[PDB]
Amino acid sequence: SSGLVPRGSHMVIRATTWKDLDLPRLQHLIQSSFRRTLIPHYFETTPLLRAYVSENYRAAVILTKLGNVPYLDKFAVLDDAQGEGLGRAVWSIMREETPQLFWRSRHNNQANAFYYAESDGYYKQDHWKIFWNGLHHFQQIQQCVAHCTQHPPTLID
Amino acid sequence: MVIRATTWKDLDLPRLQHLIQSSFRRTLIPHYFETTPLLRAYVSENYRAAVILTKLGNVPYLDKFAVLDDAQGEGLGRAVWSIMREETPQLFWRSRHNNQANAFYYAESDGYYKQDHWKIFWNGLHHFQQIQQCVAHCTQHPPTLI
Ligand SMILES: CC(=O)N[C@@H](CCC(=O)O)C(=O)O
Numbered sequence: 001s002s003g004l005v006p007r008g009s010h011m012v013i014r015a016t017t018w019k020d021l022d023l024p025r026l027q028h029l030i031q032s033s034f035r036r037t038l039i040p041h042y043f044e045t046t047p048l049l050r051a052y053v054s055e056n057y058r059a060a061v062i063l064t065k066l067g068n069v070p071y072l073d074k075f076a077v078l079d080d081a082q083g084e085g086l087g088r089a090v091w092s093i094m095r096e097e098t099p100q101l102f103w104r105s106r107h108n109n110q111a112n113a114f115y116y117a118e119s120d121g122y123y124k125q126d127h128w129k130i131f132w133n134g135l136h137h138f139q140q141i142q143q144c145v146a147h148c149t150q151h152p153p154t155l156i157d
Numbered sequence: 158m159v160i161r162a163t164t165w166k167d168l169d170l171p172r173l174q175h176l177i178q179s180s181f182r183r184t185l186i187p188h189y190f191e192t193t194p195l196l197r198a199y200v201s202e203n204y205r206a207a208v209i210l211t212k213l214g215n216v217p218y219l220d221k222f223a224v225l226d227d228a229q230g231e232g233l234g235r236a237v238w239s240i241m242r243e244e245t246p247q248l249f250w251r252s253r254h255n256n257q258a259n260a261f262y263y264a265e266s267d268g269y270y271k272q273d274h275w276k277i278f279w280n281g282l283h284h285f286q287q288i289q290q291c292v293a294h295c296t297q298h299p300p301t302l303i
Pocket residue numbers: 072073074075076103104105106107109155
């Protein structure tokens with residue numbers, strides 16, 4: 001459980017349990033990155049698959065269990081960490097061991113250019129963009145789309 | 158100011174070929190116009206932007222979106238695309254990674270799917286059954302640019 005992975009200049013914490021992360025520090029990173037509130041009891045009610053957090057908690061990728069394919073629940077990068085390559089670092093380390101992935105994004109999310117560039121697939125809905133990597137089977141994709149549709153939002157306000 | 162053509166014989170072909178080759182900076186494979194079943198083409202009067210829809214399965218297939226760099230600056234490509242969309246509610250098309258129009262395609266599409274090294278885009282399809290048919294047509298369709 002838990003260790004550090006280098007990506008170029010940067011060092012990244014890989015954790016498979018919330019117990020191995022500084023949760024108050026991680027919540028502050030997420031809420032500061034999105035300028036929104038995480039729903040109450042987020043860590044307690046979210047089944048972690050793997051989290052990747054930069055050593056100094058300036059960027060994070062959180063994968064969770066939502067059906068058969070790993071679900072990217074949060075990609076948080078501090079605005080103040082911009083240009084340092086930190087977001088790309090945590091994303092890259094995650095992708096190296098996560099060949100299949102899906103996630104969702106609001107239409108106005110500042111990360112969307114990055115998501116278009118990185119994703120293999122995309123499905124547009126009225127209020128969400130659904131993205132995936134590594135999925136070819138159309139039922140798997142359909143199930144991922146349904147999971148995004150049915151999953152309550154965990155960023156509010 | 159936009160030509161709408163349902164047969165190749167109503168277009169200036171070496172001219173259209175020159176537009177296509179300038180836009181893509183690649184060569185249009187020999188015998189393109191005679192082995193490509195036209196559905197309809199929208200071509201700017203001075204052949205600086207074109208949208209070519211062809212017959213490839215049940216859904217209209219956008220085979221070529223060719224716009225000169227300066228025409229793209231002027232928004233002419235977007236204008237021709239808009240004219241096409243007003244009478245073409247359903248369509249699919251494909252692109253490679255370096256395609257200058259990808260940002261536009263990401264914005265215009267209702268989705269995309271990667272097969273081989275193509276991204277296959279669609280508009281106006283929402284059922285995965287329809288989407289699956291379109292992707293299948295792109296797979297065994299050879300490139301027309303070299
Ligand atoms: C990738 C990522 O951060 N997904 C978050 C939030 C996206 C958003 O608010 O637009 C999600 O669960 O969809």
